[model samples]
Target chain A: HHHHADPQRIVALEFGTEVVLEAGIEPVGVIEPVATLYTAEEFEQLSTYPVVQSASLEINMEAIAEAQPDLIIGGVRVESHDEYVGIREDLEKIAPTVFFDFDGAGSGLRNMTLELSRVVGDGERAEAEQQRFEERVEEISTAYADQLADTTFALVFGVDGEFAVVNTNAWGGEILHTLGAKQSKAQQPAGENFAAFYSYEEIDELSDADVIFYETDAQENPDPFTEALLEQKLWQSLPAVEAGQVHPLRYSAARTYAQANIVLDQIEEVLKGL
Target chain B: HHHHHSPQRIVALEFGTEVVLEAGIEPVGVIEPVATLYTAEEFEQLSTYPVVQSASLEINMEAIAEAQPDLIIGGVRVESHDEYVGIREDLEKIAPTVFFDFDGAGSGLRNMTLELSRVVGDGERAEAEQQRFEERVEEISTAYADQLADTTFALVFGVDGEFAVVNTNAWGGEILHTLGAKQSKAQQPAGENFAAFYSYEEIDELSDADVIFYETDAQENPDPFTEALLEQKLWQSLPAVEAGQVHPLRYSAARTYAQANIVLDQIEEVLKGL
Candidate 1:
């Protein structure tokens, strides 16, 4: 039933913002938004949603209320500092509120989709989205499965003076699991949430892996920690490094399905080389 | 380097062919071309994709293979007549072939999608179709949710002296569910699938629905059976018929994302009355 009325405004907080975009509704207000760091295409995908929070990660309730949204969707906060949680009632005073926990692992993608679609009252549409996602996941799983059948993967990154890798619990690893690739056993779950962060020395243990991928923050300038990792003794002799299997993942914190497909494209390139 | 090649010629031999067309790429050939039945607006979305098969569903392998398609996508044909499968190997001799079970239940929509996108190697574009679809779905979902919350719907048609109703699994039911409305449970799924067919005596049961939708098949003349059903005591006594809630659905067997949107628009036309 393609009968849509004139577009209605929606106010979406940072985390579930992409979900709103995926639902095909642009947010009238956003929170703590995009960057000059993102290329034109990336920024354009992001900038079209209006910003409602300051760069310092503060929400602007007045701005959100001004958007006059028929609906509002907030998200899991960074480091669990959910400032929006305190003012959710006020936010709801302006519009119906739906909080999507994007930071929660595994269930977030499908759950956020189902929840947002239900909030919008279009579960069938959401199911269609999920079906399309499953279709895509299956396609990538098939296209890359055989070639990488014997391959094990890891997502590595260094910031400041340390290195950490993404495990199956993180969004990056979630994409890998969807692709049917095995993550390096060395990239074990850790921390309070069994998170992506781990010790720097874990690089040496990842010798079991056939391929390694490092996140590429845009601008191409290697960070100091990455430079430090490059100079380290273990990094120089890792199996994947020796085989030139270390590749660049277009590093993004945005956990949108579109972003996941972009990550798959990165792997498709890496697999083609192999 | 992103070597964006323009899409190459791809042959979609009917069934599930709509997925290919909605991805913004027309097939070099289609089976049972709709231009003969559908006119302008409706036909325009279809006509560009030419018919390769004759009226009897015969394929010109030479005609399709000569297109030099990098890939060929053939869809459903049951055991009753699997002409395409008999020629499957010959089609494969020219280029890689992918046979999708478009006749398969709910999975067909996405199964056709991922496979076709792979044939074209444009997963991102496929995802873009999902986005556009989600956008349109959300628009209709939000526009009609409240108006339809209390309403229950039905899809009715009399073909070949048989009266049939679409259940939740069919496209009509799917669209209604997406609009966040209820369906008359009386039209239970028949056989193994989520579609039901009823005899003329069962017409009285549909009064459970607030509105009953009837199909307007472009090729099918309004049969005497429909005229008789309309004239009968059972039909006139139905709540939906009495309230003037009987609506027309522009019916087509082609299940494409664009067609789904068109269906949504038709529902929107009906919902606009509320």
Candidate 2:
């Protein structure tokens, strides 16, 4: 069941913050551990917003009720169907509640943007922003067409002799794929997984790559595991490394347009140097 | 009209320098005002190579003959058909000579790369490089598909009180078109000329542009004429200018794959920022 009236005082949960904020609406209450996607300015703007959950799965009923929201925006997370059903029923008692799938297989962020925007009554703004983002993606794709066709990029990270390759299902991979960037064959996921894992000994499997983008922390530094892998002789011997084609990338977990734009900037910067 | 054997001592003239170099071949002599497109390393490598012409139109017949080349590569410039024929006969007397159209419309750099590679006996290398360039272009096109489709880009330059719009027939315009980027309707050429001229009062014609890329010199500076136009109130009032969507671009005259690659990088940089 959906709410017919426009929501003025809304409570956003999980991925709801990004969708609501991008739709030009502010929520009275939001979940804890806000997405790292927001800029310092956005963070500063939301300082007075009440936190009604300690985690995606934990909700403070009293805190949410105190906000007196006309509508409650929730999202699908790691909870079981029964768990979500119980939570939904509980939330329904307080106000009209709507749930959106935050992480699914195809076009996750895109669908959420439109769906959430509609529930929040800002579909027009969402569509306009979506169009702008799509246009930006197209421009980059067309401009770097030649480079993208020729180079095979492997989005990977490793630690303690174990490595993993990001699959198209992940945020970073989807962005690269949308830009027409070719990915290493070994990195392709076999099923509904974000990444494929392998032992360090099979490093040669990535030999086909012309470039490598390894994961980095928010501080733009590689984690210990990736650092160890980078120092290995086997990793250094790879052609992409020998040719200085490896680059560090952050924000691989971005789930919103605002975050994805940052990833696009990083990828574009690397492509320009190439 | 074509050389049957691979010539070891070759003399590259005009646009032939870039084509020959990119094909992994070095010419015994090259035309002067050597393309500004070359990197510092490439410039240094060619410092010792004898210059056989002071300009694209001027040929030092004695200097070319002294090089004792087995083959000569020439390109069509700003010369009449009769003038080129007379120059061809004179060059043919020294060695087997072949000429390439450097500035003809429709896939100019691409066709020249393959054609020149054949004359240099590096067809395989040419195809490989061509494939890489095309792939890069395809990647950019796909990545920015939405942006390119929605945004109109106006390739223009102005000086004093007059302005000119680059047509699809020009190098920069062709590159943008290949990337699926839309062009301003008023900027589209009616015929085969490189650009269309307009007076200052007609600046409003370019109002449809979402972004504007204006011409700059090799030094990465706008000309005095372009500088003057930027200062005009009419120019400032345009939407693109008012929105800070105007960008300075160089290498618009690129006629070879090497030079065009530079132009692609410049455009890619701008698109990523947007």
Candidate 3:
């Protein structure tokens, strides 16, 4: 399965802009679909798989069918299932399809790494990358295991009062979880909603969290409610707050999928404050 | 660090052992001091990481100091606030070492999933491989969700008539969790270790599991104990078992840092069995 024999040149049908920005394979082209999960800067690029439906006006199935990609990677399953069956075979007729299942592009980055990289033949790249990525997480997890093991954290993303409930698939919480921090909710409920907006009164829902991780949503301006959130009576009474553990993260590309060093960076900063 | 700017040339100390293998990143070379986790068969015959000081031997600070590497990445970190604090800088006195931390290579081909891809500049390949690996889990999880969502599974593996408790770090349990299989018991420790060799008697204590996932470590033998477990009448009386659901997994590769697809190939086979 991992022979470096014939490497399949892949053409990704990424619904999100982030996939194209990060993938090395030959992109069949970008789809017109509005990627709520994986957000990349280059959202305007047209994919080789042109949209036949023209719903979002970015997707063209003829272009995809014509590109004849070895694999069709999206959020849909080619096989039938319960949460939802997919249009995988229509894609299979053109190429083998790999669907994006996790919440964001960062999660997607890990989801189809081997399938898309293998093309039609080799699993060489997939083999090597797995080894490398593991080596990284093991470094800090082992280094800080003692201090971090018992410190539970709630994955929260907010720069303003408009807050979001993070899932295992969310970048803010995912990074913390990968770094050996305890999570309140590591699993995402299977539904259309990937995140939930929470109010200050519901702060107690984060009972198990020893700290809160706050990062700005790149898509939304969080300045609107920052003042309100800081002054809220409930917000002032949280455990991590009294412990001086609330963390504000800078928005950066590296903080998302490419966050190996940044993880240590956050840990260092958070520990210093603590 | 992700600027519009391009980084100067960098060298990886490990063989094509990092995402360089999967993502096709360019590096000066893999140095001699590091370990390549690849199986003997998977090593690149053409280009390999130089193996200079065996960890078993003396630490060759002199030899490493001579190479003048810009980054020392074998667990890249700064120590004692010295000039050589960063892995790159400490090794920089030699050349500059990018100390790669070999910590988190569990739960399916980890090195390929983390920061190694971005280090050597195989952005496209690294990102794609990450996406591909994760998506397969998502697809399979979606496939199994309806059949086993609310149900619990006693994820155990063992030898010599003893059972091993699965952990977040192990492939069998990690992949199962990826598929939405929750822990059967709150006491099901992720770090519990047990000898191999499962008997029918052990199955009764774990009868609550909706499914039984058996893994055969990539030991010398690929099909570890499938036939042995299948022949027993006691095993056949259970639901996942009576329904012919005694899945024989390639236990070895499930918790691997290299040859991740080997894990996937095993999973796809068993997942499709249903």
Candidate 4:
């Protein structure tokens, strides 16, 4: 009789290195072709995953071969060129390897969350969290539906080395687009990458822009990019800057790992100030 | 009976400026500042605002100052800056400037909503919309509670050409935290900007992270940066990369725009696949 195992003693492997140890589910170990940069802070939080450690591309194959798990869970690939893409077939020789292709940095994160959510049976938690996020959004949005109808905004990358500008695919961009933003006529590069050109002549382009959201180089950034942007002559002409539309958001708690939703609190601060 | 001869003729001076356009008995205009690089998408969405033309920093201060309404409202920086610290004096000089800071973003956005609803003079419509948003959050949260708990996520940001991770303060990080996912790590670099830094070496650290939520560079030129992230050979080895943990969220949806709640839709789409 083909019966489903109670799912104990199952072997799981994480492919992506963006782990948040506090989120609960711990892994036994990791097999990878790369090393994960865990901050000193994250290392302390990773106590639960006692054996959590880095692996070589060779490690993935060896780990699976030795463990011979009933069900093997693995992550997806963001790039088309990743060697791990077809590992499922190879992994299937020892156990069932379920793999997918992530569109980019964020594409597979959702998949991993849901998949892990299913693996550990935390589907309810995942769903509830998603709903909560929506709720917060709706609450804030409904309150200012009328006023939102009157806003214009933009997100600039103030690195200052060059006139590097972020487009619609950025984290800040995604949040605002979800909120009901009107898109700019400016051409956006396709794919999940930054594509902008410096046209110093168009400083007046942002004069009507109601707001601009951006980040400065890290607190200890060897180079302060935002300040450079501020120093730009044409930059002063933009409405947001001239009107004192500068909003310094948080990279504190919201930007710990690669999670996108972290900045909500900071954004909320921005809105309240408005 | 302090009713004045002229009802306040309000104009949200800035677009995508989330201030109370109309609050209790008195209605006023919102003076927007420049869009910060943080909430890039909201800036894009600002295009939808009615004041996209003249309502900018290059603002016709004379025109606005002349609007001569009974009341005016503006940003959260009044307490922080010297130039506009006397915003009260400036706007109050033109009209009674009601500087409202709703305890930073979250409360500010919410407070402005309630204040606007109550002060909008159309108490009925405002109240209804507010209620609608509240109820929706409740319903949505209840609907997805199951899966949310099962997943763990790390938020990574693609700014300029590098990766920065978010702490608890970022929108995506908070979303994951609220959903019951453990924080990847609590140790955050206070000085760090652009969220958290994710090096190619750190890929293994997140190999088992379950999900890797990514906030791409919010810029006109996203291609170069994202491409850079991908070209790194180590990127192909991550669990997120190998198993599809990476998620490229809409910048507009990730940033807290007025209608930022629409991010729920994006969340749902991502979760739907899992």
Candidate 5:
């Protein structure tokens, strides 16, 4: 069925909106509950679109139906997510819904872009953009390959009393690994989703990693827990700390290829300093 | 780690071998237990590569080590597969083993290619090749959009007496859907492997599809069961049958990007005739 003669009125839910944006199509309605956490570049396009759902974290079925969207875009989490399972049915009543999974060492994201663009009838444009992205990644990876060569890197973040180590399968980890940085035990692939939080005891075993990078806020605010933890004699004894390789980075980008670019840029900045 | 200047010897386990070849690098050792099923064109540039595994399907560590492969590649299945899990340590002892997930909707395969290309330190070449693929896909899609528009399709193959219907998430189906063709069963996303087997009774419901694609042998010889099933009144009464839109295609190439291109080309050829 030709659901739309080229769907102009699109509704994108949460994380999927970024992929839709990369398809060169701005959504008509975006579900961004926590609008503040996003960077200006992340949220700028949303300014033109109606914020259909906010902090409520629930779908406004009436609002969606009223918007008269021809297509609805969502993330992979929406497929089996208890919250979105029933919501998906009601949302589909308004339009044809599609979900996208973001990628590769660089490929997964390109696949996501190509598929989403096809869904939106913009495959050609998406492919062109993909070429551009691969070319850029190639340039960056080449320029930094020597500096990052076989460097064992660890990515971690303090949350509550535990530390969440980014897995090599995670977007940031995949990017860093693709750029030639070897993963530390902290970021090694284990299970589904990247990064698992572990206790302070686990940190001791992870000391062998050459460089340690901790996620910080986009606004560059220091976390009290991280600051206090670093004060511990055990944390101060870390090999990376002595080598000045323990660095702070904004680690928000997870799956989206568009955001992956931003993280890659930040990493290159760090690598350039190295 | 500057593992090698050019990785003089490479070992490939499964589908990732296609990526290695796409990257313009050929493996010195390939694990194709059943090498006869594939054509030389399909396994192009692998004239002298030693077969590390054969019908027994066991990795010969001694043979692999003898090849002196600096880098080894496998599919994503190897990471969790009980069979490959045990061999991983030994393989790693021989050389660095990398795994690439084949693909679900053809998109994943593309990601694997790009990512693997970068892994071998050939980002620029990979990007250039990917561009060609995308451009070719775009051209094919554009050439066939009008013929494919609003055409509902179903892909299936007969094994024994049952039919295995390719899901929309299938690499082949995904390729078709991306080119703007609609799916017959509301385009529902299916399980992990991209296709599911259904009984003759199940095929009754699929009668509504405008066109149907069935995987066939190279000889184009129809299976007796398939021919007999189509001979039945119920099969003859189907919409696609009456419209003469049931097509025979080679559906085995759903997981590899290189094979995906061939399939796309074949589909385009089919459409051009139509």
Candidate 6:
């Protein structure tokens, strides 16, 4: 866990790139997803790093090695044992490698930021970012106390006619829960990996929701599945949908404190209007 | 992290072998150090696994690759980042490798055992071992309440002309603290990596100790350094040493609950005599 020297040339992949960047070190190389989350200004700061991989599913070893990094930061998106084994084998040869769990207890945004920052020698910065996120959560909770207490919300997404409800354990759910938002009955049960999928016929289950928040892409646009769901007669029949209480939540896949800050901002905006 | 399937062909290294064995699964291959900690009966059970590497410092990739394991469990002994990266790169090529932090907070014997157990799908076994260790600790604490309350102890190891004192955060110190034993004045300050090294001339710092424990080898015999110190006139002059309250502690480097149980037995034996 202790490094002899601070790494000068770093290569990061997937969510790790965001963590490293948040820690204030621009990686020498990064995966393609880095372009998706950061602001134009932040992404511009990272534009110098070569793209080493398209995604965690497809790591380009040659590109990573060509970066000649002193340290490599990566993560496991899903629990694919063989895939992780293969990816780690190649990455380790290029440099001292560290991988975070992007889907476990360690994946909690605060913990992820702090742990990754410690690895990169920027724990103070991570701590400061965590403080800001916590303060903002407190501010929103206090400002929207009545609204949050009265509203039962459901965070969900629909894909191919199957809708998934995000529970209190996920990134978006966690942020909302921290902000004193209550989950609708349908989103109350602990689901598999923070989500439970149901057929379109069960869309009525969200009836208890006073407001609905659906997942969106990096650009704040709903995917085709969500759009189709929104257009469904059953979805339109829901009280929250009919009352115009549905909002699109961007950065639902946020893995770092900086991204989570944006999520906080998005949530605060929604809370202000409510 | 979630595992899709329980690993059957496990290859463990260093202290990981103990944790894996405690979890009720024998590794397919293990590093040489496993033999130094386990009892004859325990070691006999793991005789079938081929020795893959001599030590963490010198991992034999070919031997490990030949084992053809489905999962490889290893750990970082000390925090040499570069060494770990190199070792991991080679090991991951052989299997789905997972290394524990033998030198960090994650290295705590209980957490280590439980974590490795969960990885191997034998969490129940690890829980039972943990329960036994906890029960023994409670039993000893109750039995030696008065002696433990009144006595101040120091855990130290001597090498060459220098002596290192273990602090309250380390394995031996942590066990002693859990049993309600008080640390001597000099041991009160938090030391570097849970220990502080001082020259033999400064041995008088241990004068506050009512009882002293020195680390012994796997054979339960003091190494030349400890023996040499014990024979020094200044060491003999210490109150604890003069009063015959000095003892040798084996398994002080224990990295599993099963091994810590043995340490508890040794501590209880010493307590009974007191």
Candidate 2, Cα interface RMSD: 20.7
What tens-digit string does per-residue lDDT give for candidate 6 at A1-274? 1110488788877667767766667788888754446667777777777988785357888988889998887666546656777777777888888776544422254454456777778877676666566446545654576888788888888789687888766768766765658888786556546787778888899999988888887777787887888887789889998888899888776666666788889877777776
Cα DockQ of the candidate 5 complex:
0.02
Candidate 4's C-alpha runs over 4 A off are: A1-22, A31-40, A43-60, A63-74, A77-85, A92-96, A104-112, A158-160, A183-205, A215-237, A248-260, B1-274
Q: What TM-score quantifies how close candidate 2 is to the native fold?
A: 0.46
Task: Indicate whether candidate 4 or candidate 5 has the larger lDDT.
Answer: 5
lDDT of 5 at A103: 32
lDDT, residue B23, model 2: 68
Q: Candidate 5: which pairs clash?
A: A103-A108, A103-A109, A104-A108, A107-B111, B33-B54
Worst 10 residues of 6 chain A by lDDT: A101-110
DockQ of each: 0.02, 0.01, 0.03, 0.02, 0.02, 0.01
Which parts of model 1 are misplaced by more than 4 Å?
A1-7, A19-27, A34-38, A41-51, A54-57, A77-86, A110-129, A189-202, A218-224, A231-233, A251-254, B1-274
Better of 2 and 4 by lDDT: 2
Top candidate when judged by TM-score against the true structure: 1
Candidate 6 deviant stretches above 4 angstroms = A1-4, A34-48, A77-90, A102-110, A188-190, B1-274
Candidate 1 local lDDT, A1-274, one digit each (tens): 1101223677767555556655766678877555423555655777766678767667788888778887777665435546656667787788777776544454355445456665655556665554445445544544455766788888777766567777665656656754568778766555434345545676577788788877665444455676677677878688888998977676334254455556767887888877
Which digits, one per residue and each the tens of the lDDT, describe model 2 over residues A204-223?
87899899988776557787
- By descending TM-score, how would the candidates be arranged? 1, 6, 2, 5, 3, 4
* TM-score for predicted model 5 compared with the true structure: 0.44
lDDT tens string, model 3, B100-142? 3433325423553355556656556555555676777677677
lDDT tens digits, residue span A43-72, model 5: 675677777776556677777777789988
- Give the Å error, residue B141, model 3: 44
Residues B103-149 of candidate 4 have per-residue lDDT tens digits of 33232344344443344244454455545545555665567666555
**True lDDT of residue A68, candidate 4:** 50
